[PDB]
Structure formats: C-alpha cells, structure tokens
Amino acid sequence: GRLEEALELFEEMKEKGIVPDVVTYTTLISGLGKAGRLEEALELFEEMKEKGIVPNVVTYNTLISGLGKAGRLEEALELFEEMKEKGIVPDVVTYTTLISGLGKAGRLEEALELFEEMKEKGIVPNVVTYNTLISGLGKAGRLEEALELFEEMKEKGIVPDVVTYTTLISGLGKA
Ligand SMILES: [Mg+2]
Ligand SMILES: [Mg+2]
Ligand SMILES: [Mg+2]
Numbered sequence: 001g002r003l004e005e006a007l008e009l010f011e012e013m014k015e016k017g018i019v020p021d022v023v024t025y026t027t028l029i030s031g032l033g034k035a036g037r038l039e040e041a042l043e044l045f046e047e048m049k050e051k052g053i054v055p056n057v058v059t060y061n062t063l064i065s066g067l068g069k070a071g072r073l074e075e076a077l078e079l080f081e082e083m084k085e086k087g088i089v090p091d092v093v094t095y096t097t098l099i100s101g102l103g104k105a106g107r108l109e110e111a112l113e114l115f116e117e118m119k120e121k122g123i124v125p126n127v128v129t130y131n132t133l134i135s136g137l138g139k140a141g142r143l144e145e146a147l148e149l150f151e152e153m154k155e156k157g158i159v160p161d162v163v164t165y166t167t168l169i170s171g172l173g174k175a
Contacts, residue, residue, distance in 0.1 A: 003031045022053050029059055033066045041066060057083070061093050068101035076101060092123050096132075103132040108140060127158050131167075138167040143175055 010028060013020060025048040032041035045063060048055060060083040067076035080098060083090060095118040102111040115133055118125060130153040137146035150168060153160060 001031075003028075003035050003037075006031060020048075020051075020053070022048070022056060022059075025053055026056070026058055026062075030062050033062045038063075038066045038070060038072075054086075055083075055088070057088050057091060057094070060088060061091070061097075064094055065097050068097040071101070071105065073098075073101050073105055073107070090121075090123070092118075092126060092129075095123055096126070096128050099129055100132050103136050106136070108133075108136045111136065124156075125153075125158070127153070127161060127164075130158055131161070131164055134164055135167050138171045141171075141175060143168075143171045146171060 006028060010020065010024065013024075025044060029041045029044050032038070032044065041063060045055065045059065048059075060079055064076045064079050067073070067079065076098060080090065080094065083094075095114055099111045099114050102108070102114070111133060115125065115129065118129075130149055134146045134149050137143070137149070146168060150160065150164065153164075
C-alpha cells in the first residue's frame with residue numbers, strides 16, 4: 001500500500017543506474033491503478049515502452065481494468081488493439097472488463113462483437129460475461145437473443161445465477 005515509498009525507490013534506482021525491468025514497472029502500475037492514480041500508471045506505461053521494456057498481459061489488464069472502471073472506454077479499446085498488435089494475447093479478464101465497460105456504457109452491439117471474438121480465439125466466457133450481455137439484451141427488449149445466450153451458457157456448463165434468471169423472468173413477464 002506504501003506507494004509513495006515504492007515510487008521513491010523507483011526514482012532512486014534509476015538515478016543509481018540500475019535499470020528497472022518489466023517486474024518493476026508492473027508492480028508500480030498495479031499499485032498506482034489500485035490507488036486510483038490511473039493517469040500516473042499510464043505515464044509509467046508510456047515510459048516503460050520508451051525504455052524498450054516490453055509490457056505483458058498483466059500490464060495491459062491492469063490499465064484496461066482501470067480505464068474501463070473509469071468509463072474511459074475509447075482509451076481502453078486503444079490499449080486492447082495495441083496489445084493484440086504486439087502479439088500479447090488477451091485473456092478472459094481483458095474481455096470481461098471490456099464487455100462490462102461497453103455494457104455499462106450501453107454500447108451493446110460492440111460488446112456482442114467482442115463476445116464473438118473471444119470465442120473465436122478460444123477464450124472461454126464466464127458467468128460474468130454472459131450475465132452482462134443477457135442483462136444488456138434484456139433491457140433492450142432483445143429477449144430472443146437473451147434466451148439464445150442463456151441456452152448457450154447452460155450448454156457450455158456455465159451455471160446461471162439469480163441475476164441471470166431475474167433478467168430473463170423480467171423480460172418474459174413484462175414483454
Ligand atoms: Mg497517456
Ligand atoms: Mg496512447
Ligand atoms: Mg495505437
């Protein structure tokens with residue numbers, strides 16, 4: 001939790017000619033993210049790329065999570081495209097965050113497109129992914145597609161929970 005001290009040592013090591021590496025940057029970017037200090041995490045991320053330190057999936061996940069949380073979806077999507085271009089493979093956490101963020105932003109057609117894509121890449125969606133999409137479809141009156149996803153999740157052995165059922169029961173009832 002002691003971020004201002006960690007940052008002090010970080011500055012100290014650079015001043016002593018000890019070169020930070022991907023672990024150093026990751027730890028700090030994560031800590032900064034969790035501390036609300038997203039802009040500072042992003043500055044460290046820029047810096048690590050200038051120094052030739054290559055970010056990894058943990059780096060991208062942390063920033064995308066932070067940006068998604070903050071509603072900064074255009075920038076979260078920029079990082080997502082960048083990570084795929086660098087051949088850093090996104091994982092279920094990356095997609096969940098984006099589909100959730102695009103969810104909350106009511107950009108539902110884009111969330112469904114990412115959902116399609118994650119399945120093409122072999123990333124297995126989880127109950128959170130399905131719940132977000134089914135909720136979004138449910139609220140838009142797109143009941144038939146919500147029911148297809150509900151059927152799909154059961155078929156894949158993802159077990160629905162009470163919010164999944166509520167959403168659908170609500171739709172069938174008031175629609
Ligand atoms: Mg920036
Ligand atoms: Mg940029
Ligand atoms: Mg770019």
